[PDB]
Amino acid sequence: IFLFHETVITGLNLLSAIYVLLNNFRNNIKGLDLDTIQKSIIEWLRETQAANVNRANLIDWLGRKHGAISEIRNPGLVIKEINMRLSMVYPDTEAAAAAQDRNLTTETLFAWIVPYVGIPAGGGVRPEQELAARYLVDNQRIMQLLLTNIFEMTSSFNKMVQVRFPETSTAQVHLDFTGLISLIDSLMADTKYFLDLLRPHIDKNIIQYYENRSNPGSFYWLEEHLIDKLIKPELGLEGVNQIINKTYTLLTKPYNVLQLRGGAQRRDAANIQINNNPQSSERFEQYGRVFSRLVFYDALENNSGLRVEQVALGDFRLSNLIRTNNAQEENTLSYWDNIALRTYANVNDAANNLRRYRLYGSDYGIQNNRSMMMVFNQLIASYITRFYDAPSGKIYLNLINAFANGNFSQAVMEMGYAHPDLARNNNVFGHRGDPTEQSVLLLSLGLILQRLIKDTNRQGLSQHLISTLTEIPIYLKENYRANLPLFNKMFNILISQGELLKQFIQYTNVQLARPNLTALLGANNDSVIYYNNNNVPATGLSVGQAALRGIGGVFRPNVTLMPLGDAQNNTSDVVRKRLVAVIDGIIRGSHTLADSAMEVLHELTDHPIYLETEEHFIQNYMSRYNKEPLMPFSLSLYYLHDLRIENNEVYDPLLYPNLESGSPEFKLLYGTRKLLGNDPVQLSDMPGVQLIMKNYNETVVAREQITPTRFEHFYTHAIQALRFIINIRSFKTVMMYNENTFGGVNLISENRDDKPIITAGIGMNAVYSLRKTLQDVISFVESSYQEEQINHI
C-alpha cells in the first residue's frame, strides 16, 4: 500500500507531469506555426472578395481550418496589430523621419493588398501574396515566443533535450529529445513493473483504478496519450521539431522586399510598391529589438519596456549602503543641479530628491524585469540581502570577495562600469542605449558592495565583513546550506541562457538589426538616455543624472551606456556585437558568483540527507522516539504544485533563495537540496526510501522481492523526471518573460477533464503531497505518530 503509493502512483504522477508539459509545448509550437500561417494567408488572399480585405476578416480566416491548412489557436497574436507603426519593425524600407511614415501602418498594407486578391489563370501564387504573407505576420512576436519556449524546454543536463544547430541549407534548429524519450520509456517500464509485482497484494479495484485507460493519469491512459499520440505516433514530437525548424527557417530566410513609404493623408493610402532593387538587409526580418529585450531591455518602448518606477532608496533593506563612503562621513551621492556651471545638489536636496529605479527588490524574488541583466541584478540583490545579517551587521567575506575584488572589481570599485539606476525625482527611466560588457551591474548594487568591502569603523577595522566561517551564526549557516545551491543553479541558468542565445546568434543566419531609434523617438544622435525632449549625453551631464559631489558624474563614455543612435548605428552586425557583449558580461558575473557560492558551501560541513527539516533532525528524532522518521520520496513532488501568477507571469516563492531558517518552506528546501541539484543521488542519501524497500522485502518472499539495482534504477529515473519538470517550470520559465509560453502551466487540477494528475475529485490519483498543504507534509516528517500518517496514505 505504502510501496504502491511510492512507486506506481509516484511514477504515474511524474509521467503525467511530463505529458502535460510536452502536450502544452506541442500546442504552443502549433500556435506559432509560421508555415501554416503564411500558407493560410495566401489562401485567404486567393479565396477572399476585395470588400472583405481587412484584418478582421483575416483573423476570422486563420481561426478556421481550410483543407490541409490547419487553424491557428490565436490568430491575433501572430498577425500585426492594426496600428503597429511599420517603421517599428523594418529598418530605414522605411523613412521614419517624416510625419507621413506615421500614416504607414499594418492598415496601409491591408489597403495595399486589396488589388491582388484572387488566383491568376496559371494557378500560381502572386508575388504580392508572398509579400503579404511576410509583411502581415508579427514575425518578431513569433520569434520571441519560439525562442522562449525552446529556452524553457532546453535540458542539456542528463542529455534529455539538447538544442543542436546543424547548419545546412535550411536555417536548421533541432530539439534532440532522445534522452527524455528514453527516460519516459524507463519510467513507464518501471511503473508497469511495480504494477505487475504488487497486483497480487492490492485490491483489484485499486489496480484497475490506476491502470484503466479511461481514467486519466493511469498507466494505459498514458500509454495511449503520452506514447501513442505524442512521443511515437496526432502531431508527434518529431512533427513538433519539424514545425520548430520550419518556422525558424521561415523567420530567417530571404524574402522579396517592399518599399514601405506611404501616407497621403490617412492610413489607407499607399505609396507602397514592390522594390525589385533592395538592400540586402531588407530581404531579412530583423529581430534586434526582440533579442535586446531578452538580454537587457528594448529601448524603443516606454521606459525601455521595463517596470521602473522611481522609489525612495530606503525601499531596499540595505539602503543605508546605497552610499559613497562610511556612514559617519558626509555622503557625496548627489545629482547634477546645473550643467553649465557643473554644480551638484547639496546634501539635503540630494538625500530627499534622489530616487532609485525599482529594477530589483529585497522583499520579493524575480517577479518583474525577467531579462538576463535585470534577473542577474535582482539575484545579486537577494544574494546580499539574504546573507547580510542585520543584527550583527556582517556578511561572510568569501561570498562576495571574488565578485567585488576580482572579476567584477571594475563594476564595484570604479565608476562608469555600472548601469545608472539612481537619479533625482521626476526623471523617468526613459529610452536607454546599450550597456557594455562592463556595465551590466546596477550602479546601486555596486555601491552597496563597495560599502561592504571598504567600510571601516573609527579604529580602522572592517565594518561589515566576517573573515572566518567559524564566527558565522548557526542559523546563518543553515541559510547557507539551503539557499546557496539555489543561487548556484540560478546563476548557471543565466549562464546557460546566455550561451544558448550565443549559439543561436552564431550558428544561424538570424539578423538582429534595430529600427531607426533616433528618428522614431526624436532623440539626439549623441543621446545615451532619451525621454520627453531631454537628451542625456554619454558624459551623463544632464540635470538629475546621478553624480558624485566634487568628482564628477557616474557615466563613463563608451562604457556606461552607448548612444541609442540611428539606423546606421543599428545594423545587424553592430547589434550583434552589442548583444554578445552584454551576454558575456552577464556570463562572467554569474560564473564568479556561482563559484563563490559553491566555494562557501564546500567550506561548510554539508551532508544533505533527503528531508532533514534541519541539521541533525534524523539523529535527534531517533534519539527521542527510537525510530527513523518517515521520509518517502513522494513528498518531493510537493514542488509540482501550481505556480503563482502575477501580471500573467509565473513565479515560485518556495524555490527562491530568500527563505528563512525554520520556516516550513525552508524545511522543504533544506530537506530536498541535493534532490534539486545536479549531482547523482545514492539510495543512502534518501534513508526512508531504503527503509520502505527493506520493510516490503521483510513481508514478501524471495520471488516477489526487489533488488537494490531495480530500486536504484527506478529512483534514478524518478530523480531525473522530477528535476526535468522542476527545472522547466520553476527556474528556466520563471527567469524569463514567460507570458504566452508553456513552461508555467499548471500540472494539477481538481477536474479530471483538465489534467491527468487529479487532486480532490472524481478520478483523484495524486500523491499525498499534491493533495495536502505544506504543513501537512512537514508534520508528515516530524510527527512521532507514524502509524496515523501511514494511515493517511
mmCIF file of C-alpha atoms in Angstrom, residues 80 85-96 100-101 104-106 108-109 112 131 134-135 257-263 270-275 282 285:
data_model
loop_
_atom_site.group_PDB
_atom_site.id
_atom_site.type_symbol
_atom_site.label_atom_id
_atom_site.label_comp_id
_atom_site.label_asym_id
_atom_site.label_seq_id
_atom_site.Cartn_x
_atom_site.Cartn_y
_atom_site.Cartn_z
ATOM 1 C CA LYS A 80 0.463 42.509 -36.672
ATOM 2 C CA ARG A 85 3.741 51.729 -36.927
ATOM 3 C CA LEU A 86 5.593 49.725 -39.559
ATOM 4 C CA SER A 87 8.889 51.583 -39.072
ATOM 5 C CA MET A 88 9.000 49.964 -35.617
ATOM 6 C CA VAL A 89 9.922 46.570 -37.259
ATOM 7 C CA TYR A 90 11.537 47.165 -40.715
ATOM 8 C CA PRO A 91 14.737 49.323 -40.549
ATOM 9 C CA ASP A 92 15.481 52.500 -42.679
ATOM 10 C CA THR A 93 12.459 50.014 -46.331
ATOM 11 C CA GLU A 94 11.223 52.868 -44.070
ATOM 12 C CA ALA A 95 11.745 56.678 -43.841
ATOM 13 C CA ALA A 96 10.971 57.314 -40.168
ATOM 14 C CA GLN A 100 3.965 60.622 -43.307
ATOM 15 C CA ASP A 101 5.652 57.482 -42.002
ATOM 16 C CA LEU A 104 2.108 53.915 -42.569
ATOM 17 C CA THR A 105 0.747 51.014 -40.509
ATOM 18 C CA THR A 106 -0.418 47.433 -40.991
ATOM 19 C CA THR A 108 -1.834 50.518 -45.025
ATOM 20 C CA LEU A 109 -0.651 47.034 -46.002
ATOM 21 C CA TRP A 112 -2.272 47.806 -50.443
ATOM 22 C CA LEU A 131 4.932 39.666 -49.762
ATOM 23 C CA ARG A 134 5.678 38.070 -44.959
ATOM 24 C CA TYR A 135 4.703 41.626 -44.064
ATOM 25 C CA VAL A 257 11.111 43.355 -50.390
ATOM 26 C CA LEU A 258 8.519 46.126 -50.380
ATOM 27 C CA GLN A 259 9.200 49.855 -50.446
ATOM 28 C CA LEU A 260 7.307 50.885 -47.308
ATOM 29 C CA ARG A 261 6.714 54.583 -47.937
ATOM 30 C CA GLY A 262 3.223 55.928 -47.534
ATOM 31 C CA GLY A 263 0.877 58.422 -46.054
ATOM 32 C CA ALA A 270 -0.345 53.715 -50.429
ATOM 33 C CA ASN A 271 2.926 54.940 -51.830
ATOM 34 C CA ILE A 272 3.872 51.267 -51.391
ATOM 35 C CA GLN A 273 5.175 49.178 -54.275
ATOM 36 C CA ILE A 274 7.372 46.192 -54.985
ATOM 37 C CA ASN A 275 11.067 47.036 -54.628
ATOM 38 C CA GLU A 282 15.729 44.386 -46.238
ATOM 39 C CA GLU A 285 13.387 40.036 -40.986
#
